[PDB]
Amino acid sequence: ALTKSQTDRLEVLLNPKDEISLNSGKPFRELESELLSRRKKDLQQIYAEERENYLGKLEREITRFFVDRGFLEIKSPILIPLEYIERMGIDNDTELSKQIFRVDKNFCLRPMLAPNLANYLRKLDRALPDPIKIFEIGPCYRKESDGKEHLEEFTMLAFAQMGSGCTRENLESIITDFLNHLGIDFKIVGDSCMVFGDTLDVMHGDLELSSAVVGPIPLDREWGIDKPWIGAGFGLERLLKVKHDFKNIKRAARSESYYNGISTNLHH
């Protein structure tokens, strides 16, 4: 019989590979010591043989994927004008506007990559040939209720193509090649969101891995875009959660409490 505090403690030390039961007869200290030893050996092995962080490693693999397929790598500001949020159609008093991390009077931490990538599409239209293909990977921020699938600080991949080839079939083809490369099974379901209209949601079971959009849409005019486009946004921590079978997305996050899904709190 373990307390909730004892059960929580063993939960954070448990890893998906473990075949260890908390409802066995073994006392708490005996269970904690064995798990502590396992998590120490896991960090030791990483320290000796790999030393790469899962979230950084995935970013590098995704970067290579899209660069090799003709997409320009973008690194745009994380801190952006609050006015970009308005021009996306996210008015005040809308439920999405209350997820915005505001900074000073006129800036915020970006909740999405779309505004910056939209400016890059319009600007790069003066220089690059058809089609224009870009992508960015970086931090995004949303105030969220507590949940095993949501983080307030997460990492988004967003890619976009503008010009020729911007069909639903091509968008699904890119998504399929991308998730085939990561080795992640998925299905596509139609849904609607209140920024882009109807989207294609990329589902792993009931977990949304991505929302993809087939342009053009009326919002394009507010950004100086008048060509067809296709795009999608993926959550890297959600990709890692599925890939490594984490029960809670905190295991995949920028964190001081977990490293590659291994608890960093290895005290007794």
Ligand X SMILES: Nc1ncnc2c1ncn2[C@@H]1O[C@H](COP(=O)(O)OP(=O)(O)NP(=O)(O)O)[C@@H](O)[C@H]1O
Enumerate binding residues for ligand X (CB under 6 A).
Answer: 112, 142, 144, 149-151, 154, 156, 193, 208-211, 233-235, 237-238
Going by C-alpha positions, the residue among 17, 51, 65 that lies closest to residue 260 is 51
- Residue 137: CB atoms within 10 A of its CB come to 21
Dist CA 177 CA 198 (whole Å): 23
- Interface stretch with a second copy, choices 42-50, 186-194, 196-204, 206-214 (CB under 8 A): 42-50
Contacting Mg ion within 211-240 (CB under 5 A): 211
How near is the Cβ of 113 to Cl ion at its closest, in Å?
4
Residues 6+ apart with CB under 8 A from 209: 179, 184, 186, 202, 203, 234, 235, 238, 239, 242
Contact partner, 264, from Mg ion, Cl ion, a second copy, none, Cβ < 5-8 Å per class? a second copy
Instruction: Decide whether 38 or 150 has the Cβ nearer to Cl ion.
Output: 150
Question: Six-digit token pair at 90?
Answer: 């996210």
Instruction: Decide whether 162 or 212 has the Cβ nearer to ligand X.
Output: 212
Pairing of strands 72-74, 132-141: parallel
Binding a second copy (rule: CB under 8 A), the pick from 21, 33, 44, 94 is: 44
Contact partner, 79, from Cl ion, Mg ion, ligand X, none, Cβ < 5-8 Å per class? none
How near is the Cβ of 22 to ligand X at its closest, in Å?
28
Instruction: Decide whether 6 or 97 has the Cβ nearer to ligand X.
Output: 97
Distances (CA, A) of 256 to 16, 47, 152, 261, 262: 20, 17, 15, 11, 11
Burial of residue 63, with CB atoms counted within 10 A of its CB: 0-12 exposed, 13-18 middle, 19 or more buried: middle
Residue nearest Mg ion, Cβ-based: 211
Using DSSP's 3-state secondary structure scheme, residue 118 falls into helix
How near is the Cβ of 258 to ligand X at its closest, in Å?
15
Going across the sheet that includes 229-235, the strands are 72-74, 132-141, 153-162, 229-235, 207-214, 197-204, 187-193
Contact partner, 211, from Cl ion, Mg ion, a second copy, none, Cβ < 5-8 Å per class? Mg ion
Each residue 106-135 as x (binds Cl ion by CB under 5 A) or -, in order, gives ------xxx---------------------
Binding a second copy (rule: CB under 8 A), the pick from 8, 21, 22, 79 is: 79
Contact partner, 70, from ligand X, a second copy, Mg ion, none, Cβ < 5-8 Å per class? a second copy
Distances (CA, A) of 210 to 67, 132, 159, 198: 20, 21, 11, 13
Site of interaction with a second copy (CB under 8 A): 39-40, 43-44, 46-47, 51-53, 55-56, 60, 63, 67, 70-79, 101, 103-104, 109, 116, 119-120, 123-124, 126-129, 139, 141, 152-153, 254-256, 259, 264-267
